[PDB]
Amino acid sequence: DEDIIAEENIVSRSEFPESWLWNVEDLKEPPKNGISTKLMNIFLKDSITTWEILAVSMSDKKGICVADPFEVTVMQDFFIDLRLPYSVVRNEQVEIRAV
Amino acid sequence: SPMYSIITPNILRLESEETMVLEAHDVPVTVTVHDFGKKLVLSSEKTVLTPATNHMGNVTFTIPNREFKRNKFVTVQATFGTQVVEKVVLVSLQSGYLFIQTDKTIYTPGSTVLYRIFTVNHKLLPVGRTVMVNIENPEGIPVKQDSLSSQNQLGVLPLSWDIPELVNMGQWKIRAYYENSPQQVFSTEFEVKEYVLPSFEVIVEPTEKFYYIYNEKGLEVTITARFLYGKKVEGTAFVIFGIQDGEQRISLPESLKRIPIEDGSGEVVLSRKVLLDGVQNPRAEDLVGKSLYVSATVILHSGSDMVQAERSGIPIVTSPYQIHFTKTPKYFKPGMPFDLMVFVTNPDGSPAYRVPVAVQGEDTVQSLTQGDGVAKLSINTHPSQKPLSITVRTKKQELSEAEQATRTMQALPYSTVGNSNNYLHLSVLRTELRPGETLNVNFLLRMDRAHEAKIRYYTYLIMNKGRLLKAGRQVREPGQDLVVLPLSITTDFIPSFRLVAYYTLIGQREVVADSVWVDVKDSCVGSLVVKSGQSEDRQPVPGQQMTLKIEGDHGARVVLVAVDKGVFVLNKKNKLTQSKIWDVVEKADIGCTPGSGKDYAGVFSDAGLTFTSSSGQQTAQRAELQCPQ
Amino acid sequence: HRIHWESASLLRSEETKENEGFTVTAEGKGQGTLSVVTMYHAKAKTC
Amino acid sequence: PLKTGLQEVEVKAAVYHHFISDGVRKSLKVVPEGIRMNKTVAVRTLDPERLGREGVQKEDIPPADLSDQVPDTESETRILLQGTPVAQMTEDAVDAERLKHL
């Protein structure tokens, strides 16, 4: 606004998991040529990477089948990357970097 | 009244449904099952034979019990109104499968492990029984064991474990098995090792999978590195080579190179001189049978990351092809032509494509190969009963004569009585069969040349997944020598089937038979599709929401999991795929020989089938569990 | 605890945060092994 | 670093003349000084009716030394118990390999 943007009123991305959406889903839509369609909504995480989604189906009349991998890309324009070591020794000089 | 015949599967599995084919060649018949001394009675069935139905009994029953705790047998008997025929068969314990899925591949101390177990039976349908699961540390002593039941869940079991904070490192194992039969186990592996997630991926690839020893350009490889979200990378790379022998690795210190990677593209070349000087073998021909591998490391221009990628197993060969005889019948056909099916592959095992084969002995007898790398050939017989040797050699053009693969194979005769000598083989182009298509089984036949006007019909059976899928009956009128069966290929035939046919002739007693092995395309019978139901405007943004669309068969359950793509860079082994499922189900069949045994007993007992006759013209028995070797 | 034939060769572990005297008794019939391992941070007074 | 355990690091950034900004918040570990080693205190065998007094067998475990422990640090003791399957000799009679003269 009237003041140049300082660093007091910005939220920070926090969620950095490695595997999510460990759910189970059921299909009961009325058939249409034997193909039932279900619509689901998902809220993406706060990482900049490529997520891979895999699904496995197991019915009672056909058996078991495995779907194909699906890829979703999350991307921004200007951002920050932080690289940290796994563990740090107490009471010793340490250097970290931000890109 | 003349004869009565029973056709039965070789091995029957408990807690399932089995069949017998009864052929009287207006009579009530009954079948019964007794134990082996005599444990009361197991089951019995009653049926009638009708002349309008060609006297065929498709008798089905379910085999039960808890006393069945070495291997054991069971007796099946059948009385056809007045006469009794019986036979003793073996009973096994393997009664299903077990598949294990884990969300990730590599963990750190303090995290949690989440996995799932799927249970299926022989037909690949959901079942419910009792299972037990153990977790084994690298040494081998179990750490935690548990027992579970999967009733009223349609056959999916989720579980969980929590790694401690002060734990060992390395490889850990999960072993699961049914409670009834502890002889068979199923296993899965994962890793435990501290790490930090990388940021980009590196790919190393050569231009030719093999390595001809007579090239002056050595071996050339290319390096391609890319970020995870799709943009290109810059940096510097160090590459080194090696030599791999049977459990041995030798490093060549003279071959270490530094190259600048710009836009993700680097080139490395290795010459003959360095390879020759690295080893103490001036003779080049001594190097055949030893492999090569290359290792690379990529660093950025900001000094922030470090990634390593390795490709192993570049073979050293002089012939860029290979011949095989894995699926060719071994017993030839006296008089009638003999059909061969060759198999050509690349040195890495990938099937070849559009390469011609031939025979050195004859001329112009050649063909090509479809996408499976299989070529069909035919050859005439002497027909003297002396065994014959055949040779195969590749006849590809635009190549020197000194670089053609070849090999040899031997055949053995067939021991008939009275020289009936009748066979079966389909004269159709062996192509990519697909479900929903049609097949034309062509009975290429040669009866006795004297009085071939007495035979009225034949009998044929289809075998798949170790069970009798269908039994037919096709007739003919005297004076013919070719008949056709227009089979309709359905979805249940996946992944392969075996056709066996026979007929009976009045002598003394005559029975003649043969068998054929056919394969179909492999894919799951159902269909599951996942895609983006969103309008697909642009790339998403963190914290947004989107829509996911699924399509599948009605009344099923879909399980999901999402994993980052940076984990697969660290360790990308032991995943789940449909090819694995088909490999597992295919590897555990009964009849392992392609077919066409030495005689009628040979052909009937080489396809996991048992034939019993009222005149004592039976087949031998087996009491082991796997075919030799 | 109770060690049977079926559950044999199953490592059973317990933890403690202090070092004091113990007292362990065994009854029945068979053979078994017991081990105690104490681990800590030591002083080892650089690339 | 000054204290052991888990620690949190924040970084913020803003852009002039435009309404865009960013901020990251990560975590790392801090561990004490020295090296990690294990000490074996006691290994014993249990076999009643042959080593004890009328079935009941009683033992005793002395305390560990811990002479050179780093100040302000915690140790940890683990007790491992296992059974040994001792399926012994005196097996079946001669197998059915040479029972063909019967």
Side-chain angles (χ1 to χ4, degrees):
Chain A
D1 305 342
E2 56 91 12
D3 194 5
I4 51 173
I5 308 174
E7 288 84 350
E8 69 279 4
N9 50 358
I10 49 180
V11 304
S12 294
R13 300 145 36 202
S14 181
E15 299 281 5
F16 299 104
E18 294 259 19
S19 61
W20 60 273
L21 201 49
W22 188 257
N23 274 330
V24 66
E25 176 152 325
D26 190 1
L27 304 169
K28 66 177 84 80
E29 175 91 26
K32 180 255 292 178
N33 193 19
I35 291 172
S36 304
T37 297
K38 184 149 201 283
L39 275 298
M40 76 176 303
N41 276 301
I42 55 177
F43 279 86
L44 261 53
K45 285 312 185 163
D46 309 307
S47 289
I48 303 186
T49 177
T50 309
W51 303 97
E52 165 168 353
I53 305 169
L54 183 144
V56 173
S57 158
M58 182 179 72
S59 167
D60 213 337
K61 287 292 222 304
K62 310 276 192 196
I64 190 167
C65 178
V66 175
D68 291 330
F70 188 42
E71 295 204 53
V72 162
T73 298
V74 183
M75 181 45 168
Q76 274 204 22
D77 174 80
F78 181 76
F79 61 106
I80 286 184
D81 186 74
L82 209 54
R83 309 299 306 159
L84 287 200
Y86 177 48
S87 77
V88 168
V89 180
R90 182 181 70 192
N91 271 321
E92 270 200 7
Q93 286 274 115
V94 164
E95 196 197 28
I96 62 152
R97 289 171 179 269
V99 186
Chain B
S1 65
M3 293 177 70
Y4 301 91
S5 63
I6 287 184
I7 310 284
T8 310
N10 189 179
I11 307 175
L12 57 88
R13 268 74 62 97
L14 55 88
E15 292 271 32
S16 288
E17 180 161 1
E18 293 82 3
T19 61
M20 271 146 288
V21 167
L22 307 169
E23 200 255 337
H25 187 193
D26 283 304
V27 54
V29 307
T30 62
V31 293
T32 319
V33 166
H34 303 312
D35 206 354
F36 211 90
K38 269 280 301 200
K39 179 187 178 291
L40 186 63
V41 63
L42 277 300
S43 176
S44 71
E45 271 77 31
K46 190 142 173 58
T47 318
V48 67
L49 276 73
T50 289
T53 75
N54 301 320
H55 316 269
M56 301 305 168
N58 184 4
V59 166
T60 67
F61 76 96
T62 288
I63 187 55
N65 197 342
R66 82 188 207 88
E67 192 213 357
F68 296 78
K69 70 177 287 282
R70 284 284 99 192
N71 61 6
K72 49 170 67 76
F73 316 127
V74 66
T75 302
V76 61
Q77 88 171 36
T79 175
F80 284 42
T82 57
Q83 189 274 331
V84 290
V85 291
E86 55 86 23
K87 183 92 177 150
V88 170
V89 294
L90 195 143
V91 177
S92 175
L93 273 298
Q94 173 182 3
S95 56
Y97 301 108
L98 278 175
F99 299 106
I100 293 183
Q101 183 205 23
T102 54
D103 49 7
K104 263 203 296 190
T105 317
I106 174 164
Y107 302 75
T108 80
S111 176
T112 49
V113 190
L114 294 174
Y115 52 93
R116 268 166 178 154
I117 289 180
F118 306 105
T119 75
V120 297
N121 70 346
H122 307 87
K123 266 170 281 154
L124 262 60
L125 273 77
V127 292
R129 284 201 231 171
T130 311
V131 73
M132 293 182 286
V133 170
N134 309 343
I135 297 90
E136 302 184 359
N137 72 331
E139 312 155 3
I141 42 167
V143 176
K144 145 196 169 185
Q145 78 186 128
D146 189 4
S147 168
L148 295 166
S149 164
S150 76
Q151 299 268 313
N152 189 359
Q153 288 200 44
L154 183 62
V156 162
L157 285 201
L159 284 160
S160 62
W161 196 50
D162 62 357
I163 309 174
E165 162 72 62
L166 202 53
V167 74
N168 206 343
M169 311 275 158
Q171 299 288 321
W172 296 56
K173 271 180 59 84
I174 310 169
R175 313 213 86 150
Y177 56 80
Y178 278 156
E179 181 167 290
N180 290 328
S181 57
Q183 286 172 344
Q184 202 177 359
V185 291
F186 304 82
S187 69
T188 309
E189 283 209 0
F190 65 89
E191 202 163 3
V192 170
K193 177 180 59 49
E194 61 86 20
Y195 69 88
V196 70
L197 184 64
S199 50
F200 62 95
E201 73 174 0
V202 177
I203 295 94
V204 291
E205 67 176 1
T207 69
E208 304 300 314
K209 186 53 198 192
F210 61 95
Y211 174 43
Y212 192 31
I213 51 174
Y214 290 167
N215 299 332
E216 73 261 11
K217 306 174 72 65
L219 186 136
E220 43 274 30
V221 292
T222 183
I223 302 299
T224 302
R226 267 174 85 266
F227 275 119
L228 268 185
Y229 41 87
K231 322 290 273 198
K232 299 309 202 286
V233 72
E234 319 211 339
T236 312
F238 298 149
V239 297
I240 200 167
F241 293 82
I243 279 176
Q244 173 78 48
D245 297 359
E247 174 36 70
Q248 197 162 3
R249 287 159 169 253
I250 313 299
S251 298
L252 312 186
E254 298 142 1
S255 66
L256 196 147
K257 290 279 302 305
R258 147 172 65 213
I259 44 170
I261 286 180
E262 294 273 344
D263 211 339
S265 80
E267 272 209 63
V268 187
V269 175
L270 163 67
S271 57
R272 276 180 64 92
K273 320 194 317 305
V274 190
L275 185 135
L276 285 188
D277 297 328
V279 296
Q280 318 91 302
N281 214 305
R283 304 141 310 290
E285 277 66 34
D286 210 358
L287 296 187
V288 185
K290 303 187 273 199
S291 63
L292 258 60
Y293 68 86
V294 61
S295 180
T297 294
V298 180
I299 63 170
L300 286 164
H301 274 96
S302 75
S304 310
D305 291 331
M306 201 95 88
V307 194
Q308 304 185 56
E310 188 177 37
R311 182 177 178 86
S312 71
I314 312 299
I316 280 182
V317 289
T318 186
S319 87
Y321 288 125
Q322 189 176 3
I323 314 285
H324 278 260
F325 277 119
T326 313
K327 303 153 101 175
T328 301
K330 289 283 150 287
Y331 295 137
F332 73 93
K333 307 158 78 75
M336 293 182 286
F338 184 35
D339 306 338
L340 275 75
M341 296 192 162
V342 77
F343 190 18
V344 64
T345 57
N346 292 49
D348 71 78
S350 71
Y353 182 76
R354 260 64 177 283
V355 55
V357 300
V359 187
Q360 309 162 194
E362 292 83 4
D363 183 81
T364 316
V365 177
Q366 64 186 339
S367 65
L368 274 298
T369 79
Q370 69 275 17
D372 269 330
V374 169
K376 162 83 168 293
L377 302 168
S378 86
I379 189 65
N380 297 266
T381 64
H382 306 174
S384 85
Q385 206 167 0
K386 263 295 304 191
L388 75 163
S389 299
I390 193 66
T391 179
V392 286
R393 173 178 264 267
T394 287
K395 198 81 69 163
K396 192 174 182 184
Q397 72 174 20
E398 61 97 24
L399 204 62
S400 70
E401 208 269 353
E403 309 169 0
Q404 306 298 325
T406 196
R407 83 172 313 131
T408 316
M409 182 215 58
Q410 187 53 44
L412 279 74
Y414 178 92
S415 77
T416 182
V417 194
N419 192 0
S420 290
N421 199 354
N422 312 136
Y423 272 131
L424 184 146
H425 43 283
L426 78 173
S427 78
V428 71
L429 276 299
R430 181 73 83 93
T431 64
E432 282 93 18
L433 202 46
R434 280 267 181 86
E437 292 210 348
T438 182
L439 192 49
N440 212 358
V441 170
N442 188 358
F443 276 19
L444 293 175
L445 294 174
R446 183 178 181 270
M447 295 299 102
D448 44 350
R449 180 65 65 192
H451 65 94
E452 71 269 7
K454 180 65 177 67
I455 308 309
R456 300 309 300 124
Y457 50 83
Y458 316 96
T459 310
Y460 72 102
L461 320 172
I462 297 90
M463 261 284 278
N464 192 349
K465 282 178 198 167
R467 70 165 144 74
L468 282 72
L469 185 45
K470 184 169 72 175
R473 183 176 176 87
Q474 190 256 348
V475 301
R476 72 146 176 76
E477 62 90 22
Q480 294 176 342
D481 281 321
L482 290 175
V483 288
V484 291
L485 267 294
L487 260 189
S488 59
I489 291 294
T490 185
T491 317
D492 197 296
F493 289 142
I494 315 187
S496 83
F497 71 96
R498 192 180 314 249
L499 184 60
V500 61
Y502 88 94
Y503 88 97
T504 290
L505 188 153
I506 298 292
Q508 50 275 12
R509 180 78 273 171
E510 290 295 80
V511 286
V512 186
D514 198 77
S515 81
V516 172
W517 161 271
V518 194
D519 62 332
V520 298
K521 190 68 178 295
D522 311 331
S523 283
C524 65
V525 298
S527 191
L528 200 75
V529 180
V530 178
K531 60 171 169 291
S532 76
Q534 211 193 9
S535 294
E536 210 158 9
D537 312 331
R538 292 168 197 177
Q539 284 172 344
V541 169
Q544 195 180 3
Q545 70 175 356
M546 65 179 288
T547 302
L548 208 72
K549 193 208 305 190
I550 320 181
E551 295 165 353
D553 267 16
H554 175 94
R557 293 179 67 188
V558 191
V559 309
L560 282 76
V561 57
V563 64
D564 194 343
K565 208 180 180 180
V567 171
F568 293 158
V569 181
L570 275 189
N571 189 359
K572 48 188 290 165
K573 289 149 69 212
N574 198 274
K575 276 161 66 173
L576 195 58
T577 304
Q578 195 79 5
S579 45
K580 165 169 312 190
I581 306 190
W582 296 122
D583 175 8
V584 160
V585 65
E586 185 72 24
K587 190 178 290 294
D589 59 356
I590 298 194
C592 64
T593 302
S596 171
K598 57 194 180 179
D599 64 329
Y600 75 97
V603 306
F604 266 82
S605 200
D606 216 347
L609 195 64
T610 298
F611 160 69
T612 71
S613 158
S614 86
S615 289
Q617 211 66 36
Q618 65 180 19
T619 64
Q621 74 176 178
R622 90 181 213 176
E624 62 177 9
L625 272 298
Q626 303 86 344
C627 69
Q629 305 162 23
Chain C
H1 295 288
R2 181 178 300 274
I3 314 286
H4 270 174
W5 202 96
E6 297 88 292
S7 71
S9 82
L10 173 58
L11 193 70
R12 285 161 180 93
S13 79
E14 288 82 2
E15 271 86 330
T16 315
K17 279 284 184 163
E18 66 267 12
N19 48 346
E20 307 284 15
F22 280 28
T23 175
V24 61
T25 70
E27 299 181 2
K29 65 179 73 175
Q31 274 87 358
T33 179
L34 187 141
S35 309
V36 182
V37 167
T38 309
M39 65 180 288
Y40 63 92
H41 272 87
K43 177 195 303 296
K45 202 175 185 172
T46 183
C47 72
Chain D
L2 280 182
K3 209 157 54 64
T4 78
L6 270 289
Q7 308 301 326
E8 171 161 277
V9 183
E10 284 211 320
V11 162
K12 294 191 173 170
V15 194
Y16 279 168
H17 293 338
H18 315 311
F19 313 150
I20 48 178
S21 52
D22 201 317
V24 187
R25 164 169 85 230
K26 286 225 177 165
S27 75
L28 74 164
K29 283 192 34 192
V30 178
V31 289
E33 292 178 352
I35 62 167
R36 199 186 283 145
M37 64 204 306
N38 56 5
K39 177 153 311 183
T40 304
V41 161
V43 174
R44 304 280 176 82
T45 185
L46 305 165
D47 190 1
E49 284 97 28
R50 197 180 68 84
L51 283 79
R53 178 141 49 75
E54 183 216 0
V56 172
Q57 189 199 27
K58 289 191 59 179
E59 305 278 325
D60 188 358
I61 314 296
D65 48 4
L66 270 72
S67 74
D68 53 355
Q69 202 182 9
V70 169
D72 194 3
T73 312
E74 301 159 1
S75 85
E76 184 178 1
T77 303
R78 308 166 50 194
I79 295 92
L80 298 161
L81 195 146
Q82 202 181 342
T84 60
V86 67
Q88 46 93 40
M89 320 178 290
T90 317
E91 296 290 334
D92 299 334
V94 174
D95 298 340
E97 192 189 335
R98 294 304 186 214
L99 281 191
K100 317 210 186 195
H101 39 68
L102 162 53

